[PDB]
Design an enzyme around this catalytic site. Structure first.
Site, mmCIF file in Angstrom:
data_model
loop_
_atom_site.group_PDB
_atom_site.id
_atom_site.type_symbol
_atom_site.label_atom_id
_atom_site.label_comp_id
_atom_site.label_asym_id
_atom_site.label_seq_id
_atom_site.Cartn_x
_atom_site.Cartn_y
_atom_site.Cartn_z
ATOM 1 N N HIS A 127 30.477 -37.472 -44.758
ATOM 2 C CA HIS A 127 31.354 -37.302 -45.435
ATOM 3 C C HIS A 127 32.621 -36.570 -44.689
ATOM 4 O O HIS A 127 33.480 -36.683 -45.036
ATOM 5 C CB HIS A 127 30.838 -36.184 -46.486
ATOM 6 C CG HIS A 127 30.540 -34.824 -46.460
ATOM 7 N ND1 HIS A 127 29.345 -34.557 -45.946
ATOM 8 C CD2 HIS A 127 31.720 -34.378 -45.482
ATOM 9 C CE1 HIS A 127 29.233 -33.275 -45.216
ATOM 10 N NE2 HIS A 127 30.880 -32.788 -45.126
ATOM 11 N N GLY B 64 32.684 -26.103 -42.730
ATOM 12 C CA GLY B 64 32.957 -26.068 -41.096
ATOM 13 C C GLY B 64 31.507 -26.311 -40.334
ATOM 14 O O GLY B 64 31.959 -26.744 -39.127
ATOM 15 N N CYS C 289 28.754 -28.410 -41.419
ATOM 16 C CA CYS C 289 28.138 -29.523 -41.929
ATOM 17 C C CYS C 289 27.794 -29.916 -40.552
ATOM 18 O O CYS C 289 28.863 -29.792 -39.843
ATOM 19 C CB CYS C 289 28.905 -30.680 -42.784
ATOM 20 S SG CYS C 289 29.334 -30.489 -44.272
HETATM 21 C C1 LIG Z 1 26.592 -30.872 -54.765
HETATM 22 O O1 LIG Z 1 26.442 -29.752 -54.501
HETATM 23 C C2 LIG Z 1 27.959 -29.659 -54.311
HETATM 24 C C3 LIG Z 1 28.054 -29.509 -53.242
HETATM 25 O O2 LIG Z 1 28.930 -31.335 -53.078
HETATM 26 C C4 LIG Z 1 29.308 -31.002 -51.749
HETATM 27 C C5 LIG Z 1 29.309 -32.761 -51.416
HETATM 28 C C6 LIG Z 1 29.545 -33.295 -49.983
HETATM 29 CL CL1 LIG Z 1 29.940 -34.924 -49.729
HETATM 30 C C7 LIG Z 1 30.175 -32.048 -48.487
HETATM 31 C C8 LIG Z 1 29.875 -31.199 -49.463
HETATM 32 C C9 LIG Z 1 30.921 -29.955 -48.457
HETATM 33 C C10 LIG Z 1 31.814 -30.389 -47.344
HETATM 34 C C11 LIG Z 1 32.565 -29.333 -46.557
HETATM 35 C C12 LIG Z 1 33.669 -29.478 -45.783
HETATM 36 C C13 LIG Z 1 34.151 -30.272 -46.494
HETATM 37 C C14 LIG Z 1 36.002 -30.449 -46.059
HETATM 38 C C15 LIG Z 1 36.587 -30.303 -44.601
HETATM 39 C C16 LIG Z 1 34.754 -29.849 -43.501
HETATM 40 C C17 LIG Z 1 33.866 -29.173 -44.372
HETATM 41 C C18 LIG Z 1 32.732 -28.493 -43.290
HETATM 42 N N1 LIG Z 1 31.357 -28.603 -42.696
HETATM 43 C C19 LIG Z 1 32.305 -28.439 -46.320
HETATM 44 N N2 LIG Z 1 30.361 -27.856 -47.060
HETATM 45 C C20 LIG Z 1 29.603 -26.952 -46.858
HETATM 46 C C21 LIG Z 1 30.420 -25.245 -46.806
HETATM 47 C C22 LIG Z 1 29.391 -24.167 -46.647
HETATM 48 C C23 LIG Z 1 28.104 -24.139 -46.541
HETATM 49 N N3 LIG Z 1 27.989 -25.753 -45.964
HETATM 50 C C24 LIG Z 1 28.510 -26.786 -46.423
HETATM 51 C C25 LIG Z 1 30.446 -28.702 -47.526
HETATM 52 O O3 LIG Z 1 29.082 -28.158 -48.934
HETATM 53 C C26 LIG Z 1 30.173 -30.323 -50.719
#
Ligand SMILES: COCCOc1cc(Cl)cc(-c2cc(-c3ccccc3C#N)cn(-c3cccnc3)c2=O)c1
Ligand SMILES: COCCOc1cc(Cl)cc(-c2cc(-c3ccccc3C#N)cn(-c3cccnc3)c2=O)c1
Lengths: 299, 299
Positions: free
Chosen positions: B41, B140, B142
C-alpha cells in the site's frame, strides 16, 4: 494507538556485551572502548569479603574476557567502588555514543538480560522508590546492564549485582555505586518498604485517555494538599508541584488538568475499578514515566 | 527470579530496517540481502485499489529506499501477495541468518516499532485467536516487523499493515499473506470476537508457581472435558490433549499435573482473585507461551 511495556531497541548495547571469567566464576561485562566493566564480586569465592585484599592477590592473567568467540587480552585492572574495570588491548569497534548516568527513583530503563556474555531478552523496568528493581534475572545474569537511549546516545544507568531473598534485584550505576543501602556481600539485607510512583500512575492515566479509556474520569477536582493526604493513606509517593509541571504537556494535549486527573486517582484508590480495566490492566500501573507516555503515544 | 514481558534482543533486526518512499508516502521496509520488503500500500494514494494497475504504472525510479543515510538504488520491483519486493543494487551486509515463518494464533513474537526506517521501541505481543495483534503503533509504523530468535536465526513472522477502527492491528507474514480475513483496503472490516488463549494462561500459572505465587493452587483435579465446559462459558479457547502434552515439562518441573492446574483456573474463572495478584497482575495473562515460560524461568 495501543500502549505496550516498550523497551528501547537493544542493538547498540548487544554490541558491547562480553563474558568475564575469573577463576570458577563467569558473568557478564560491558566492553566500551578498551575498557570492560563488570561486578567486582566476580573475584569472590564472600560472606564478608575485603575486595582490596582479593584484588591485590590477582593479576591480569586471572581474568579471561571473551567477546563473541575471540578472547580479549587484559592489560590492566582496577576497582572503582563496586565495579571492576578491565583494560583490554583492543578497543570495541561497536562502541556507541554513550554516557554513564545515575538515575532517580521512579525513572524507567530498559534491561538487556545476558548470560555468558550473550544477550537473552530485553524488558522495561523502573527504579523503585526503595532502590530495588523488579527484574527478571537467572543465575549468571550479573553484569547485565540497564539503559536509556536518547537520539543515538546510550545512557547506561544500571548494572545488575544481586538478587535479594524477596526475589527483587539490586545493583549499581556504571561507576559502581549501589542504588540504595545495599552492599555486595552475602549477608542479611532487606529493602525498605516500597511505595507506588504517583506521577507515573498519573502519566499512565493520561496515556489511557489518549487511547480512549475514560470511564474513570469525573467532573471533580482536588487540591494538591488534599490529594497527598489520600496518597499517604494508600502508600503512594507524595505529588510535588514539580511533578505537576512535568505533567504539563500531557494535561494540555488531553485538556485535562493535572489536579482534575488527581481526582480520578482518588476515586480509583477509594472505590477500586469494579471489574473494569485500564489499558488492559486491572491495577494502577506505575512503571511509565511522563516522558515514556509522550514518546510512545505521540512520538 | 522475577517474570517480565520480555522481548528478544532487537539488534539483528535493527540492522535490516530501511525507509521506503513512493511519491508522497513514506513507511518502513525490511532489507535482507539485495531485496527490500514493504507493504504494497506504499504505492497507494485507496478506498478500492487495483494493485496490479497501480504497480504497472510505476518504475524503479518511483521508489526511494534510504538505509541509514545512504540511498539504495532500486533495480527491480515486484508484488508477492500484499508485500512489495524491491530489488536493490547492494546486498545488506548486516543480513542475519533468517527465515520467514507463518505463525499460528496464540504464538508470541517481538515487535520492533520503526518510523522512517529508524527503530523506536521493542515489545512482546501475541497473535490473537481472531488474527489481530494488540500492538502499539503510530502513523508511519507500517512495515515494522515481528520476529522470534532461535539460537541466532531470526524468524520473521509479521509485517504491520493496518490499524483497525478498534485500535487493534492487522498485517501479513513476510510473504504477504494477511493473518485473518483482512485485506489492504480502506473499507469496513471488523475482527472476529476474540477469545482467551487457555494454554498460555496455564503456562503463566506455572510461571507463577516457579516464582512462588501459590495462593491459587488447590487439591482438586478436573477432567479435560469438564474443564472445556467452563472454558467455553468464559470465552476461553478449548484445551486440547496436544496442549496438555506441550505443558509436559512445566508440569514436571513444578510437580503439578496439567489437569490439576486446570482446576485452579476453574476457581479463578469462577471466584475471581478477591484482591490478590499473580506475577504482579490482577487478571489472567495469556500472552506467554509454554516455551516463553521455560525460556525466561529456566533458560
Ligand atoms: C481496514 O481497517 C481500516 C484501516 O484501513 C487501512 C488500509 C490500508 Cl491499505 C492502510 C492503512 C494505514 C495506512 C497508513 C499510512 C498511510 C499513508 C502514509 C503512510 C502510512 C504508514 N505507515 C498508516 N496506517 C497506520 C496508522 C497507525 C498505526 N498503524 C497503521 C494504516 O493503518 C489503513
Ligand atoms: C544480599 O542479598 C543476598 C544476595 O547476596 C549476594 C551478594 C553478592 Cl556479592 C552476589 C550475589 C549473586 C551472585 C551470583 C553469582 C555467583 C557466582 C557466580 C556467578 C554469579 C552470577 N551471575 C548471582 N546472583 C544472582 C542470581 C540470580 C539473579 N541475580 C543475581 C547473585 O545475586 C548475591
Amino acid at each position: 494507538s495501543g500502549f505496550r511495556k516498550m523497551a528501547f531497541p537493544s542493538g547498540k548495547v548487544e554490541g558491547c556485551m562480553v563474558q568475564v571469567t575469573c577463576g570458577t566464576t563467569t558473568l557478564n561485562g560491558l566492553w566500551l572502548d578498551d575498557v570492560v566493566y563488570c561486578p567486582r564480586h566476580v573475584i569472590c569465592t564472600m560472606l564478608n569479603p575485603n575486595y582490596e585484599d582479593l584484588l591485590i592477590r590477582k593479576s591480569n592473567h586471572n581474568f579471561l574476557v571473551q567477546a563473541g568467540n575471540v578472547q580479549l587480552r587484559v592489560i590492566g585492572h582496577s576497582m572503582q567502588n563496586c565495579v571492576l574495570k578491565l583494560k583490554v588491548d583492543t578497543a570495541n569497534p561497536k562502541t556507541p555514543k554513550y554516557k554513564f548516568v545515575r538515575i532517580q527513583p521512579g525513572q524507567t530503563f530498559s534491561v538487556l538480560a545476558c548470560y555468558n556474555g550473550s544477550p537473552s531478552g530485553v524488558y522495561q523496568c523502573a527504579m523503585r522508590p526503595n532502590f530495588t528493581i523488579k527484574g527478571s534475572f537467572l543465575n549468571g545474569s550479573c553484569g547485565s546492564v540497564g539503559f536509556n537511549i536518547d537520539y543515538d546516545c546510550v545512557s547506561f544507568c544500571y548494572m545488575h549485582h544481586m538478587e535479594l531473598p524477596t526475589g527483587v534485584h539490586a545493583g549499581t550505576d556504571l561507576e559502581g555505586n549501589f542504588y540504595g543501602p545495599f552492599v555486595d556481600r552475602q549477608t542479611a539485607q532487606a529493602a525498605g518498604t516500597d511505595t507506588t510512583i504517583t506521577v507515573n500512575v498519573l502519566a499512565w492515566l493520561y496515556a489511557a485517555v489518549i487511547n480512549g479509556d475514560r470511564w474513570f474520569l469525573n467532573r471533580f477536582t482536588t487540591t494538591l494538599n488534599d490529594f497527598n493526604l489520600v496518597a499517604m493513606k494508600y502508600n503512594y509517593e507524595p505529588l510535588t508541584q514539580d511533578h505537576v509541571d512535568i505533567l504539563g504537556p500531557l494535561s494540555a494535549q488531553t485538556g485535562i488538568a493535572v489536579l482534575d486527573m488527581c481526582a480520578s486517582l482518588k476515586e480509583l484508590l477509594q472505590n477500586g475499578m469494579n471489574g473494569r480495566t485500564i489499558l488492559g490492566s486491572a491495577l494502577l500501573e506505575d512503571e511509565f514515566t511522563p516522558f515514556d507516555v509522550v514518546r510512545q503515544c505521540s512520538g
